[PDB]
Structure formats: structure tokens, C-alpha cells
């Protein structure tokens, strides 16, 4: 639910998806990539007041009942997507799928 | 990996698995579980000096304007087997994603 549809419409201070465009040559020094020239990688950022996994719900409950709280949550990636690229070995084209390059959704963990 | 084997007897300040024992009745208010009385839930915590996090770390050095800074969070989760009663009939259940097994900087 903390995806582009929800986040990229109203700039919110709390956790959720943030737009980020990365140029391979300029931003990463990956000069060998023929296609694409860059991509919408995005990132996750913002305050976590907001309980995806059973373990996250357990910790959240424990932190209120035990006098000594454990960890506090932070904004991180939930769903990721690969990115397909094109490079050349001499004149031979090579297509590669790079897993987990794009962040589609965020969560407080 | 950032797991019990690496982290537990090597207490350092960077991102690591940390021990946390939780008592069901005392800490959660879950009075229905018969066995076990508690379990090692653990958690992830510490400083952070996937391909997306590795590209973000590279972008943050090359671009003059850095984006997000990494978080210490749960990587792998494990189920916990419990025993409870529905009346006087025993019921074993595997409760999904109850334990954190390893951590990551993301």
C-alpha cells in the first residue's frame, strides 16, 4: 500500500516510496550498459509511527508491554523488481536480468 | 551472514541479530498458548556503514546529493511451533514469521 499510486500524489513526512532516477554512466560509473541509459530505482524514506509481518507486530506489542523496549521501526523496501539490461561483447548483444533493482513498495520494519 | 552464529558471542555496534526472549503471557498478553511459555523472537539493530541497496550505496557516493541511508532490518524469518487447547483437545500450529533468523542493511 505504500507504493507509487499512494505516495507519488501527496508528499508525506512518514515512511513510503520516494522517486529516484539513476543514470548508469553518470550516477554509477557503469559505462558498459547500452540499454536503458537509466531507470526509476526509487527508495524508501520517512518517519515510522504504520505492521506487515507477524514478527513486526510482536515487536511492536512487546515494546509497549515490556518496560525495556527493543528495536524501533524504520522505512525500508518491501516489494522489489528486476531490471533487464543490454550490453555488447564486441558486436554481440547480451541481455541480462538483474534481480531486485527497483523498489515498488515500502514498509516500517 | 548476519545471524545468531556470527552476532551472538561477538557483540559489536554494526547491524546484527540481537537476542530477544519473549514470554507470551507477560509480554504479549497471549494467555491461550500451552507450550512453549516463550521463545527467542530476536531482532535486528545496529549501524550500517540486495542489488537495490548496493546501487543506492554507489549512487550516494558518486552523486553530490545522496538519497537514503541504510537501516538494520530483518532479512530471513522462521516459523515457531506452538501447542494450544480448543476446549480439552490439543492443537499444534506452526505460526509463520515469528522469529528473525538473519539481518541486513537496507
Amino acid at each position: 500500500a505504500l507504493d507509487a499510486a499512494y505516495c507519488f500524489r501527496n508528499v508525506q513526512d512518514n515512511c513510503c516510496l520516494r522517486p529516484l532516477y539513476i543514470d548508469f554512466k553518470r550516477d554509477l560509473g557503469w559505462k558498459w550498459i547500452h540499454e536503458p541509459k537509466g531507470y526509476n530505482a526509487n527508495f524508501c524514506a520517512g518517519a515510522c509511527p504504520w505492521s506487515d509481518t507477524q514478527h513486526s507486530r510482536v515487536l511492536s506489542l512487546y515494546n509497549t508491554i515490556n518496560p525495556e523496549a527493543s528495536a524501533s521501526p524504520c522505512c525500508v523496501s518491501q516489494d522489489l523488481e528486476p531490471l533487464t539490461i543490454l550490453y555488447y561483447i564486441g558486436k554481440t548483444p547480451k541481455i541480462e536480468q538483474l534481480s531486485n533493482m527497483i523498489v515498488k513498495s515500502c514498509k516500517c520494519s | 551472514a548476519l545471524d545468531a552464529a556470527y552476532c551472538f558471542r561477538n557483540v559489536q555496534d554494526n547491524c546484527c541479530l540481537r537476542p530477544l526472549y519473549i514470554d507470551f503471557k507477560r509480554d504479549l498478553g497471549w494467555k491461550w498458548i500451552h507450550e512453549p511459555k516463550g521463545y527467542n523472537a530476536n531482532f535486528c539493530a545496529g549501524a550500517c556503514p540486495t542489488q537495490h541497496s548496493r546501487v543506492l550505496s554507489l549512487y550516494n557516493t558518486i552523486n553530490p546529493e545522496a538519497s537514503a541511508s541504510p537501516c538494520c532490518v530483518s532479512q530471513d524469518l522462521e516459523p515457531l511451533t506452538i501447542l494450544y487447547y480448543i476446549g480439552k483437545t490439543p492443537k499444534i500450529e506452526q505460526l509463520s514469521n515469528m522469529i528473525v533468523k538473519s539481518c541486513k542493511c537496507s
Partner: antibody
């Protein structure tokens, strides 16, 4: 559209300096905020920033003495400087990156707007 | 790390004359265009003039222009107005784990007599 720095007029040597930059008209989740100091009779010196995304970067001369952070809910950017010497006497400005972070086009080393500046004197 | 050298230290000119201020970076700025110019008057914060080496900020008179790429940059004031006598600074943007930005030492544009 506005930035205002606040701090103590004086600090005694060895103590820790705390400065605030109160922001108005723009979100800290959208813009990078920088600290820039100017010793008397000297030029502008970039200290560091807290990025629109939450990353803090510093000049190599900072030597870990500076901490720049933010609290979006309070519209505040903070500067903490430890083990203060006479060499830290200066006007301290907070300066916003001209444009929002993250797009294919950045701010191109432009800072706009700037706050009026706060004078910090380090003396016993 | 990166050092911006502004020359000359002082430029003495009369109102109406052309002013050219140089800024040279030790390493190429990020994307060869991460370079901005600022004007500073006494008791005031710096004022943004030009960004991305050559783009004039809104409300800045057309007599100001910027040029250059990589390491060598110039700010030109076509015909100096009395309000243009001030200190001018260049700022560069860089790759790195520190020193993301740096300012040059500044050039004073002084009234000739």
C-alpha cells in the same frame, strides 16, 4: 520558501554547540538542507547536509565533530558541533538545495534560499 | 579534496566596464556542469546568480552570464552597475564520500578610482 537559524550567542571552548534551522514553505522530505559557515573576514565554507532522503554528508575537515540531522514533524534541521575551539567562531548559515532531490536533473551546486545567518563566538 | 581557485582575488573596475571572473576546479565537477555563482554583500547571506555553469536564476539581470565546463569557468558582467560591487563566489558539486560541495575563495569586485 524560508529558513531561520537559531543558536546561543556564545559557547565556551571544549563545549558542544547546538544550532537549529527552522524551515517554512517546503518539505524536508523533498529538499536537502546544508550548513555553511563564514569566519569573520573569510569566505564561505560548506560544512555538510542532511539530504531530502535522510543521508548526512560532511566536508573532510569536519573530522566527525559535526552532526547534521532533521526532524520533519517539527520543520527543523539541526547542527551539533563538539569540542569547540576559537577556530569555530563564525556566522553559520543554513542553505536549501535549489531543487527537489531525486529527479533526472539535480540542483547543479545551487543553494537557494539561504537563512540570514547566526553568529557563533567561541570564547572563555 | 577538490579546490576551487578564483582569480583574480580583487577586480578593480569602474561602473559601465565589462567584468570577467574566473573559477578553476582541481578536479572536474560532477556531470561537468555542477557549478554555481553567488554574490555577497556585507551583513547578508549569499545570493544565487547562476547555476549549472550558465543558467541565470529568475530575477537576476541579463548582464550576468556564465560559461565553462569541466574545470574552467567564467562569470561575466557585461556592463557593471554600482550595485554589482560585491564579493562573488563559485561553488562546485563533486562525487565522493565527503566534500560533496566546495566554495571558491571569492573575488572582490572593487570600485576603481
Amino acid at each position: 520558501q524560508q529558513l531561520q537559524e537559531s543558536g546561543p550567542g556564545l559557547v565556551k571552548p571544549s563545549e558542544t554547540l547546538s544550532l537549529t534551522c527552522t524551515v517554512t514553505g517546503f518539505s524536508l522530505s523533498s529538499y536537502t538542507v546544508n550548513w555553511v559557515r563564514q569566519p569573520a573576514g573569510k569566505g564561505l565554507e560548506w560544512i555538510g547536509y542532511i539530504s531530502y532522503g535522510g543521508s548526512a554528508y560532511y566536508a573532510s575537515w569536519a573530522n566527525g565533530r559535526f552532526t547534521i540531522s532533521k526532524d520533519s514533524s517539527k520543520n527543523q534541521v539541526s547542527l551539533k558541533l563538539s569540542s569547540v575551539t576559537a577556530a569555530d567562531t563564525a556566522v553559520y548559515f543554513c542553505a536549501r538545495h535549489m531543487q527537489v532531490g531525486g529527479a533526472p536533473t539535480g540542483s547543479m551546486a545551487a543553494f537557494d534560499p539561504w537563512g540570514p545567518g547566526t553568529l557563533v563566538t567561541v570564547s572563555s | 579534496e577538490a579546490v576551487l581557485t578564483q582569480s583574480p582575488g580583487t577586480l578593480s573596475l569602474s561602473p559601465g566596464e565589462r567584468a570577467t571572473l574566473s573559477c578553476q576546479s582541481s578536479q572536474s565537477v560532477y556531470n561537468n556542469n555542477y557549478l554555481s555563482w553567488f554574490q555577497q554583500k556585507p551583513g547578508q547571506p549569499p545570493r544565487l546568480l547562476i547555476y549549472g555553469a550558465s543558467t541565470l536564476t529568475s530575477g537576476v539581470p541579463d548582464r550576468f552570464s556564465g560559461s565553462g565546463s569541466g574545470t574552467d569557468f567564467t562569470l561575466t558582467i557585461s556592463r557593471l552597475e554600482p550595485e554589482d560591487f560585491a564579493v562573488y563566489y563559485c561553488a562546485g558539486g563533486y562525487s565522493g564520500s565527503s566534500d560533496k560541495y566546495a566554495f571558491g575563495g571569492g573575488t572582490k569586485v572593487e570600485i576603481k578610482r
